[PDB]
Amino acid sequence: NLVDNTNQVEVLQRDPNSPLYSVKSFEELRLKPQLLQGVYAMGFNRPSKIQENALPLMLAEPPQNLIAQSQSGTGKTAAFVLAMLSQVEPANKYPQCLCLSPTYELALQTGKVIEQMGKFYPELKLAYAVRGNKLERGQKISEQIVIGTPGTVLDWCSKLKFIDPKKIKVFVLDEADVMIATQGHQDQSIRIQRMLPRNCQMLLFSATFEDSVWKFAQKVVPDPNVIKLKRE
Amino acid sequence: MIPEREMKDFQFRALKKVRIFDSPEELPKERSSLLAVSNKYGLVFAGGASGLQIFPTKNLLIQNKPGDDPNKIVDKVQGLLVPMKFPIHHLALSCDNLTLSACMMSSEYGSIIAFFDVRTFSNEAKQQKRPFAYHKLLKDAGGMVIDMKWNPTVPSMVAVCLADGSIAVLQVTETVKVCATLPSTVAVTSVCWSPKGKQLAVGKQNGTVVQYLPTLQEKKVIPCPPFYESDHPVRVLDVLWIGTYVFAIVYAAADGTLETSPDVVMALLPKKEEKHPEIFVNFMEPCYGSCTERQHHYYLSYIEEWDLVLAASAASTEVSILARQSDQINWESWLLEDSSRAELPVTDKSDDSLPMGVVVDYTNQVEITISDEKTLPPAPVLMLLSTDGVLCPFYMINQNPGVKSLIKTPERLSLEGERQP
Numbered sequence: 001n002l003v004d005n006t007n008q009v010e011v012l013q014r015d016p017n018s019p020l021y022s023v024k025s026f027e028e029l030r031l032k033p034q035l036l037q038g039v040y041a042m043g044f045n046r047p048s049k050i051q052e053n054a055l056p057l058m059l060a061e062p063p064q065n066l067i068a069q070s071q072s073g074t075g076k077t078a079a080f081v082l083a084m085l086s087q088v089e090p091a092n093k094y095p096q097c098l099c100l101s102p103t104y105e106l107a108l109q110t111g112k113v114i115e116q117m118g119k120f121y122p123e124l125k126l127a128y129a130v131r132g133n134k135l136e137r138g139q140k141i142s143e144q145i146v147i148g149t150p151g152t153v154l155d156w157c158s159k160l161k162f163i164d165p166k167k168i169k170v171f172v173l174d175e176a177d178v179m180i181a182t183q184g185h186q187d188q189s190i191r192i193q194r195m196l197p198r199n200c201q202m203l204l205f206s207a208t209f210e211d212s213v214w215k216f217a218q219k220v221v222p223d224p225n226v227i228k229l230k231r232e
Numbered sequence: 233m234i235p236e237r238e239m240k241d242f243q244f245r246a247l248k249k250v251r252i253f254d255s256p257e258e259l260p261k262e263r264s265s266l267l268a269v270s271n272k273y274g275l276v277f278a279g280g281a282s283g284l285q286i287f288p289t290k291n292l293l294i295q296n297k298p299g300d301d302p303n304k305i306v307d308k309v310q311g312l313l314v315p316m317k318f319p320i321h322h323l324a325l326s327c328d329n330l331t332l333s334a335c336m337m338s339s340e341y342g343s344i345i346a347f348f349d350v351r352t353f354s355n356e357a358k359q360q361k362r363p364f365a366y367h368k369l370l371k372d373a374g375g376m377v378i379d380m381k382w383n384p385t386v387p388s389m390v391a392v393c394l395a396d397g398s399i400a401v402l403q404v405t406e407t408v409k410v411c412a413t414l415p416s417t418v419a420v421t422s423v424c425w426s427p428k429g430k431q432l433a434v435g436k437q438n439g440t441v442v443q444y445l446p447t448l449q450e451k452k453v454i455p456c457p458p459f460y461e462s463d464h465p466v467r468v469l470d471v472l473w474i475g476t477y478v479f480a481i482v483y484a485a486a487d488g489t490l491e492t493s494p495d496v497v498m499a500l501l502p503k504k505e506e507k508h509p510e511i512f513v514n515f516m517e518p519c520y521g522s523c524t525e526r527q528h529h530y531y532l533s534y535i536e537e538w539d540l541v542l543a544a545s546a547a548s549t550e551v552s553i554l555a556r557q558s559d560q561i562n563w564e565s566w567l568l569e570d571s572s573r574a575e576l577p578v579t580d581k582s583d584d585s586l587p588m589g590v591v592v593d594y595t596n597q598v599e600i601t602i603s604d605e606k607t608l609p610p611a612p613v614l615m616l617l618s619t620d621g622v623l624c625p626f627y628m629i630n631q632n633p634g635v636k637s638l639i640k641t642p643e644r645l646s647l648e649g650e651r652q653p
């Protein structure tokens with residue numbers, strides 16, 4: 001499950017003079033009860049190293065944007081699923097959170113994590129905007145979270161009129177480094193992003209972080225907090 | 233409604249993007265066509281506001297290596313710059329690949345077509361590459377070439393359509409002969425030769441497509457499709473004559489509005505031995521339009537062996553495909569996977585780049601390096617020139633069953649027979 005890391009998180013806060021780091025419990029985060037219960041059901045106990053700094057920023061009042069770098073098994077996914085689930089209102093039957101995955105097979109993987117952690121949200125439903133979904137033109141998605149690969153997601157927001165992107169509250173880009181390396185994905189994501197509202201929360205996660213990826217991250221996450229955790 | 237189909241046996245595979253011209257200050261708005269390709273000799277011709285550039289095609293094609301940023305633009309590549317006194321809005325090549333036409337607008341003098349003998353580009357003993365003949369369209373603003381097409385089988389013959397609605401058929405040998413013309417009141421908006429090159433089809437402001445012998449004697453009228461009302465009147469924007477009784481026809485708002493979006497319509501025609509009406513199928517906006525600032529223009533081409541049509545549009549960042557069905561009569565959109573599409577990039581200032589020119593190379597001899605370990609045979613390469621001055625090449629991999637390789641080895645250009653100024 002969690003990968004070990006002696007190292008420390010480096011944190012560039014969006015606001016230099018507004019220190020607000022480090023939660024050492026989930027109970028501190030003032031999650032909705034059904035979200036904390038979700039967490040509990042998953043067996044989590046303490047936030048992970050990356051989560052300890054990442055969650056207070058993402059779940060700030062109001063939420064803040066983030067570029068985060070940490071290796072596999074640090075808890076990135078868990079952290080952003082919490083992020084999306086805490087903004088979602090199931091009452092409202094239309095997409096509010098939008099997660100981009102570099103592949104089909106991860107779009108589903110992350111989906112499962114969303115479904116498991118959102119277990120106690122009544123009527124929470126997920127759409128998968130990925131290769132080979134069945135949807136006919138004319139339809140409009142009533143699922144409150146959408147996960148998928150950038151091209152199909154872009155179609156749903158534009159061409160096909162499936163999602164109104166002006167209504168999304170949280171946008172996640174998982175695995176930036178892999179994303180960019182895939183044909184089409186960078187431009188696709190930029191195109192999605194640009195049509196999200198100003199107040200949308202943007203979050204971006206990568207394992208690696210070379211200059212291509214950093215410069216991409218800057219186009220996509222305005223006014224970011226940046227977090228790095230050196231690999232071990 | 234619109235027929236569509238997930239195609240997993242076709243992918244566009246991006247090669248590195250290559251900068252040709254420097255990024256412009258403003259978005260280029262006017263109808264233009266700035267890429268030509270010699271598939272006989274392996275040359276590409278690119279034009280802009282800023283000269284004409286000729287490359288050996290293989291120099292423009294560079295494959296991504298694992299490790300490389302597939303979004304990094306190569307800065308330049310060796311080719312030849314031919315200075316031009318005025319900006320170019322249209323480039324085209326004759327069917328023998330020996331005559332390049334370059335259309336220019338001068339604010340002072342109006343429009344002129346320059347004709348280059350393609351050997352002159354190869355003539356090391358000419359430091360300056362001059363055209364051998366001009367053709368001056370007395371016209372100034374209404375003299376913009378808006379469509380111009382060489383005959384697919386008569387090398388000396390070219391069809392030219394201007395903004396004012398007039399049209400002309402030219403014969404270009406060692407000099408320029410006007411063979412046929414039709415005045416502006418005919419209202420031509422677009423033009424396209426029959427496959428064998430025996431007739432000319434012209435799109436028109438009134439929404440019809442008229443067929444003509446090269447002498448411009450009228451042969452057949454295709455009426456404006458019945459589904460368009462009188463209070464939503466349209467004009468042919470572009471036309472592609474695919475088979476004798478088969479056409480792709482693009483309609484746009486008669487009045488010039490950019491806001492409405494064009495309809496790509498497939499049309500099947502009856503025969504003399506039929507009294508059926510014309511069958512039209514509206515596929516509508518297969519190249520999704522993100523831009524309402526540019527003059528509409530669909531870049532259409534048919535690839536017989538694959539029985540499909542490639543489509544690009546001045547208002548869209550995406551290339552679309554319309555294939556004939558196993559059926560052999562009807563057409564369908566191909567819906568391709570996210571990482572196998574052909575899209576122009578976002579400019580570094582975060583705007584969309586759009587197409588100014590579109591061609592396909594069939595002289596590529598390099599094999600596609602897939603994994604470390606896997607390699608596929610050479611494929612044709614789609615090439616787009618963007619509004620940002622970047623060239624965008626994509627291999628077209630058609631893995632559908634029974635499709636025969638379209639690759640054709642190129643020849644050396646001999647200076648023999650070069651025409652002089």
Ligand SMILES: Nc1ncnc2c1ncn2[C@@H]1O[C@H](COP(=O)(O)OP(=O)(O)O)[C@@H](O)[C@H]1O
Nearest residue numbers: 001002044046047048072073074075076077078
């Ligand atoms: N705070 C936590 N406590 C216990 N397990 C966790 C915690 N956060 C994540 N995990 C588990 O550890 C694994 C890695 O989490 P994940 O969010 O997938 O890491 P990453 O996204 O960085 O690859 C998963 O099995 C996940 O359920």
